[PDB]
Ligand binder design. Structure first.
Ligand SMILES: NC(=O)N[C@@H](CC(=O)O)C(=O)O
Ligand SMILES: NC(=O)N[C@@H](CC(=O)O)C(=O)O
Ligand SMILES: [Zn+2]
Ligand SMILES: [Zn+2]
Ligand SMILES: [Zn+2]
Ligand SMILES: [Zn+2]
Ligand SMILES: [Zn+2]
Ligand SMILES: [Zn+2]
Ligand SMILES: [Zn+2]
Ligand SMILES: [Zn+2]
Ligand SMILES: [Zn+2]
Ligand SMILES: [Zn+2]
Lengths: 354, 354
């Protein structure tokens, strides 16, 4: 017997188009999404060119409309030059992304004053999300309070971070957060297997105590989001490995495994991959859209999943229980048992919908 | 310039049919909902007969399908006899309502052991909501923990209650809650004007400190819900006044007034009248459904609103800013400037939808 889920939403993916299409493109990355039970993705702006102004957003919008197989929204990225320039296009984006630490991006902001300027100029009713690690979480929360608005923290990975967010929520501060599967299911213990190149990710893998703190504080986690960050094996295994893991095809199977073990409920999963993404990012429903999963199917993650061009995975060898059987998107069969059945371009920009 | 909102959801209404139809019926109560910008309502089970078994639910379902003008879900009610008997129909209901204090209902449970029995037998993935005042909030939270499941607290009205819920959320306990407009906008200060009959409501009106504590702790409030509880003026003004206020037609205008004063944002309103109702009660989207409001229109609440058969209101004389201009429900104009334009029976049981 299958179980039917609503269309799941991943609010943090890297689809690499424009400019990195050997790693992934809209067509391959959204095929990976559908195979992972994801029918809507929010794509990060750290592409080449980066999505930091109106002409780059327009280009990316057309590339996504032509290549995407599931529906999508595109983030804008904050830069050191573009505060106060995004107002006419802000509503067409998923939100504004701030890169506040070193990672795979050229968009790091060098002064908290630049963060303040973005918080003051971006429309106050639209989302701001931040790459903000360790003390940077506290710093960006301070900027949010000074400008009296909300903030969403991307890929929370550490005990320190989740406890800070917990303390802020207890004081009634408007903060939400997401956690990525690798920070729930991998730790320092896995770095020997992965090696130093494959193991490169930001935030870095945490200790067992970090992983246990995230699970213990599940009530504080508003969303799961993959931070699907594909790079080729050649890049991961080379002399200057970029940080990031592919994850669209493995996120839901890993989480279903945890559900099967009683670590969280199916409702907990649906709040974090459907309802809270909708409400934090104001994302629309998808009509006649659902995901059919088999909760009982046991399998072992192989050395690469079928669709991502990354052609590797850090979860190789993990035993999982649960699999995606069929996805229907807006009344068309989009995926069945390893075959994607909607073409590049089927997907639509959800921010253009009524 | 108007503003377009999604279809708002009221998870706590009394539509009085069957058995109290001089107070309200499905047709009049859903007309009141639409005029208040509400396109989906969850109707409480304290009718005559009360909705405490399968035959009563079947009757109510057909009466609602024939009379409702907006969409709906029907609660089941817990009784001293029906624990362990509702499993086949539980999924067809909005949830299970527990009456744990004295109020307008014959369904009070007389032993916490009966509460435990319901928490143990009702399907653990479906909603339980409770009328639970003062220490009863703590008691029902204890029962929820002992049975390791969630609970939703209806019409939170007191500083004591919101602070208890806040403490439980800080410990990661799965509790949500709602607040009704009269406990945000009326207090002991209004009892002289209302008088002792009209002023009868459960929970009773609080002190100014109770009202201020609810506002100060808005981050703890998951939903707004009217507890629309219509009774005629003759009943309210007579020798044994029943408790309750009508409220569908005044809820959104009162809350829009607060938005206009900066007391909360429009997003705060949409989380509490749309997104969190959806996610707590697993309620489906409504296609081609929206509510158009004028945020600038100033008016004074009259001695009765047009649609509720209660034909009175405790908010008479309050100045408000904001009004519902037009409602579209599933592609049909349902309401425009004081005229309902969909007939009794247009509304549907959302739990029968895919
Ligand atoms: N997380 C990573 O390690 N890499 C991400 C960037 C990011 O999310 O910081 C990427 O785009 O490769
Ligand atoms: N709240 C009230 O004062 N009355 C409600 C019952 C309830 O919500 O307890 C009613 O049904 O009249
Ligand atoms: Zn397209
Ligand atoms: Zn990041
Ligand atoms: Zn993110
Ligand atoms: Zn990222
Ligand atoms: Zn929204
Ligand atoms: Zn009908
Ligand atoms: Zn009640
Ligand atoms: Zn309620
Ligand atoms: Zn009630
Ligand atoms: Zn749901």
């Amino acid at each position: 017997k299958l179980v039917r889920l609503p269309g799941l939403i991943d609010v943090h993916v890297h689809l690499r188009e424009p400019g990195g299409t050997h790693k992934e493109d809209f067509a391959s990355g959204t095929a990976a999404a559908l195979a992972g039970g994801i029918t809507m993705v929010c794509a990060m702006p750290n592409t080449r060119p980066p999505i930091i102004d109106a002409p780059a957003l327009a280009l990316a919008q057309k590339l996504a409309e032509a290549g995407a197989r599931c529906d999508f929204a595109l983030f804008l990225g904050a830069s050191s030059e573009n505060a106060g320039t995004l107002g006419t296009v802000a509503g067409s984006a998923a939100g504004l992304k701030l890169y506040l630490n070193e990672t795979f991006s050229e968009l790091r902001l060098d002064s908290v004053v630049q963060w303040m300027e973005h918080f003051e100029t971006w429309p106050s009713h639209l989302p701001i999300v931040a790459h903000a690690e360790q003390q940077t979480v506290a710093a960006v929360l301070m900027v949010a309070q000074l400008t009296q608005r909300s903030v969403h923290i991307c890929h929370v990975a550490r005990k320190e971070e989740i406890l800070l967010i917990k303390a802020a929520k207890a004081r009634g501060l408007p903060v939400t957060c997401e956690v990525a599967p690798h920070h729930l299911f991998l730790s320092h213990d896995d770095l020997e297997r992965l090696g130093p190149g494959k193991g490169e990710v930001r935030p870095e893998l945490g200790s067992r105590q970090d992983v246990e703190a995230l699970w213990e504080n599940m009530a504080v986690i508003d969303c799961f989001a993959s931070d699907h960050a594909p790079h080729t094996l050649e890049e991961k295994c080379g002399s200057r490995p970029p940080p990031g893991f592919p994850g669209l095809e493995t996120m839901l199977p890993l989480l279903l495994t945890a559900v099967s073990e009683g670590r969280l409920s199916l409702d907990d999963l649906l709040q974090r991959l459907h309802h809270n993404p909708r409400r934090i990012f104001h994302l629309p429903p998808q009509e006649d859209t659902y995901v059919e999963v088999d909760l009982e199917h046991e399998w072992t993650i192989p050395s690469h999943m079928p669709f991502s061009k990354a052609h590797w995975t850090p979860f190789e060898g993990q035993k999982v229980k649960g699999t995606v059987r069929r996805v229907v998107l807006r009344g068309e069969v989009a995926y069945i048992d390893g075959q994607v059945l909607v073409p590049p371009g089927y997907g639509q920009d959800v921010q253009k919908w009524p």
